[PDB]
Design a protein around this nucleic acid. Structure first.
Ligand SMILES: [Zn+2]
Lengths: 213, 136, 67, 25, 101
RNA sequence: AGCAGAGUGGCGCAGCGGAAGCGUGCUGGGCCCAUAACCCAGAGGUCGAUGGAUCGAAACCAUCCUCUGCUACCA
RNA sequence: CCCAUGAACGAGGAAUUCCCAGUAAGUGCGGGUCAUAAGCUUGCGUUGAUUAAGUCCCUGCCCUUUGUACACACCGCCCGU
RNA sequence: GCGCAAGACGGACCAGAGCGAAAGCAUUUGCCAAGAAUGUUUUCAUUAAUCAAGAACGAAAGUCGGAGGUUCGAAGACGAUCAGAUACCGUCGUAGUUCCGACCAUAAACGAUGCCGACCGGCGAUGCGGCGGCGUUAUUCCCAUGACCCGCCGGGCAGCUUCCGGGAAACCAAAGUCUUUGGGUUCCGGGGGGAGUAUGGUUGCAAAGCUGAAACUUAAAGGAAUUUGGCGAAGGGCACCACC
């Protein structure tokens, strides 16, 4: 019986160039021996990091998923994998006496990044409203879903990956929706809740060079 | 066991999954990705009585043991990820997480971002039992 | 175990109601002397006064109810 | 007894009467 | 005899609602008949808040809550003393109990 | 007729040097308003018999007796 | 009353009674029965504590609400082979 | 922790809210068809209401023939609980649970309350359609529209109070307009058991469904409400003939 943790070497991971904080953290792996190489063992790894610990003193309830692809020797570079929202805030949005509208579009960027976006909006109770209802008709819900569909479709296909990610750092899609969709029914709680990777193109190292400087 | 890191200026982050049910507690600590473990001790490690292995005292003892292991190995900061049984059984965390969090904080282990990550179903399959439930 | 917990002595601040099945236990509000800011609740057997300092073998648990 | 299980034992008596009626032909 | 004006539920012009399961039990109960408990509580209540805040990396940190919905059968609601029986004239009161703390 | 198993409380059984127990049956008491369940206590033992080794055997030694497992009237 | 006789009993199983201050307990003295007369009972005095200022868990009691196929009143009523 | 494969279901939003003749109906989009209410100085002119015969729909379970079987899980194999436990509890697990196609026609299928029409108090909200009106938002002017506020009109699910009135009472704005007894119309009950039973007819592959007695026995069986006792009912207090 010997300690397996004496054969562990600490690594470093670096965020892409859209993030102000460069160092994310440290990970460890077994020392390489023969057939299995430590570079392959860090191939599929996903880290669940928050935005407030990655960009600046921004909001703290948005989480990002990052996956490494290559190692330069005690130094790993990652690329964007997905975006998801923190659970407590998301279930604090949902309360009784209001309706929530969901949408989902498979849209892709100018390169081979096939995305899957989810947006949720909540109806606003007015300031002088006496009625506890704050309800909406079904055709208004369909129109709001169609408008959110067009908004989160339009701001994707003319943009590359970096500009989409820099758009995702604030809630600019949500503000643009609640400015655009308030002619039908006013909304107070609008954000994009989930972005997924479905298909990934070929890995060539030029993007991983220019996305980290 | 030896590494070139800065102690006074910065800190090392890992994550710790605390799964607490009404039958057992799980204090499991991994790296930031969650792929690679650090140490895993459970409520059956400290008490040999099968009556109360989800007791707060057993979870406290397991949390102090894994805190001592992370201190001797060189992990200083932890991101708490809380978990219940999940599925269709229950959503309330078990009676070990409340003592486990306080025992992890009391040992000198710095705490970052705490979160509840439990499997929530969107109307999954049928719960165990009859239509009338378990009559006791 | 394999760990010697240092014995800490704590003084009460306010006595609560008497807990237990037969009412033989008592809830008290003790406070530490190495740093006079911390207040926890412990289960005591026997009569206690106000300002009565108690010895504690451990300083980590919290008081449970009559069960 | 309640009506449910008295009904069930009446149906079982009906069943036994039906088989002896069919096999007593 | 007729105990309540309704049937202890909220079905007037439907005839069928979607059944749900209990939390303490596994009993199949209709949705409008079950007792609902939308509880709001913190992870650490009143004792470990100072220990978390004094061992935290971040200053000025908010503590997240637990938002779960409890669905109770009638027998499980009485046996856990969530709701208790009332007088015949006091049964008709429909307001929730007032909150102070 | 020849070789082996068992011989222990009314019944079945554990035991092999420092040493009479188990399950069951009987009797009595408690618990309860009373009964049944539950608990406690005891009586009941040439450990099949003979002689010997050993400081000391129910067990170790040789024999016989009683009931069973296999050959069967073998001239 | 006197001399001999010197048994069981080595702090007691299941269970169960009484009590919290001059109290329990130890210790003796009066009265009742009494011709002869206290191991019982009612009083009295001496010595004199441990623990606790609470609870509804057990055994029960008082009030309110609710349920009942009970009312000779749950030690009630009742279904079937 | 990363993905793969299969099947089921659509949480929080979800309410005494909506639709449908009832059973029933909850992810997004597209196609087809149908319908209530509102609006109308549009059209036919009594075409209407209830309904033996007859006909459609009809939860779950059950049957027949396929595909598929993730979870749950009648019968069954066990482990404990118990004097007994083939029961409550726990681990597995068969038909079934899911879709297609052919069957049966049963529920506390309840609002235990048939359908149409009229009359008879109020109050504040709710969903739809329509109308009127100070004001705010869609960034500052105007108009209409969506989003709020103030009121009405018609239909629908409902709620609160009531010496209108009724009932045995619980309660009901209908269960009222009933001895001061009649608006029209269909089904159905004459004490409790025997009994939805025997037989006859009929439907069905089967399980069974519809129609449906008698002999005999019985002086009570029931409905509402009150007062006691009893709860292994709840909420407050007490006792050394209770406990610590
Ligand atoms: Zn339940």
């Amino acid at each position: 019986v010997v300690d397996p943790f004496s054969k562990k070497d600490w690594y470093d991971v670096k965020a892409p160039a859209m993030f102000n904080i460069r160092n994310i953290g440290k990970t460890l792996v077994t020392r390489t021996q023969g057939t299995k190489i430590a570079s392959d063992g860090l191939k599929g790894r996903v880290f669940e990091v928050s935005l407030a610990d990655l960009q600046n003193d921004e909001v703290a309830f948005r989480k990002f998923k990052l996956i490494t692809e290559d190692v330069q020797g005690k130094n790993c570079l990652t690329n964007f994998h997905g975006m998801d929202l923190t659970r407590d805030k998301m279930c604090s949005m949902v309360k009784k006496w209001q309706t929530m509208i969901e949408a989902h579009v498979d849209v892709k960027t100018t390169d081979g990044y096939l995305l899957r976006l989810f947006c949720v909006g909540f109806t606003k109770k007015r300031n002088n409203q006496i009625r506890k209802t704050s309800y909406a008709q079904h055709q208004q819900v369909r129109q709001i879903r169609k408008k959110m569909m067009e908004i989160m479709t339009r701001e994707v296909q003319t943009n590359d990956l970096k500009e989409v990610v820099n758009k995702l750092i604030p809630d600019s899609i949500g503000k643009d929706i609640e400015k655009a969709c308030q002619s039908i029914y006013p909304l107070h709680d609008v954000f994009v809740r989930k972005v997924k990777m479905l298909k990934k193109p070929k890995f060539e190292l030029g993007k991983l060079m220019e996305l980290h400087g | 066991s030896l590494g070139p890191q800065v102690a006074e200026g910065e800190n090392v982050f890992g994550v710790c999954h605390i799964f607490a049910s009404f039958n057992d507690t799980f204090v499991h600590v991994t790296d930031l990705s969650g792929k690679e473990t650090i140490c895993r001790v459970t409520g059956g490690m400290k008490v040999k009585a099968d009556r109360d292995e989800s007791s707060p005292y057993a979870a406290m003892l397991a949390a102090q043991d894994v805190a001592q292991r992370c201190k001797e190995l060189g992990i200083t900061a932890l991101h708490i990820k809380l978990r219940a049984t999940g599925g269709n059984r229950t959503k309330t965390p078990g009676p070990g997480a409340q003592s486990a969090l306080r025992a992890l904080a009391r040992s000198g282990m710095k705490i970052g971002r705490i979160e509840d990550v439990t499997p929530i179903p969107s109307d999954s399959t049928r719960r165990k039992g009859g239509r009338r439930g378990r009559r006791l | 175990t394999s760990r010697v917990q240092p014995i800490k002595l704590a003084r009460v601040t306010k006595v609560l109601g008497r807990t237990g099945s037969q009412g033989q236990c008592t809830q008290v509000r003790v406070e530490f002397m190495d740093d006079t800011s911390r207040s926890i609740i412990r289960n005591v057997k026997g009569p206690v006064r106000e300002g009565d300092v108690l010895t504690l073998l451990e300083s980590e648990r919290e008081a449970r109810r009559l069960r | 007894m309640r009506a449910k299980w008295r009904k069930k034992r009446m149906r079982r008596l009906k069943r036994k009467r039906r088989k002896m009626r069919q096999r007593s032909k | 005899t007729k105990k309540r004006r309704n049937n202890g539920r909220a079905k007037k012009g439907r005839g069928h609602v979607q059944p749900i399961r209990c939390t303490n039990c596994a009993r199949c109960v209709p949705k409008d008949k079950a007792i609902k408990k939308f509880v709001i509580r913190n992870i650490v209540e009143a004792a470990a808040v100072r220990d978390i805040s004094e061992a935290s990396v971040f200053d000025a940190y908010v503590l997240p809550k637990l938002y779960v919905k409890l669905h109770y059968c009638v027998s499980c609601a009485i046996h856990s003393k969530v709701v208790r029986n009332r007088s015949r004239e006091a049964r008709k009161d429909r307001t929730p109990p007032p909150r102070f703390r």
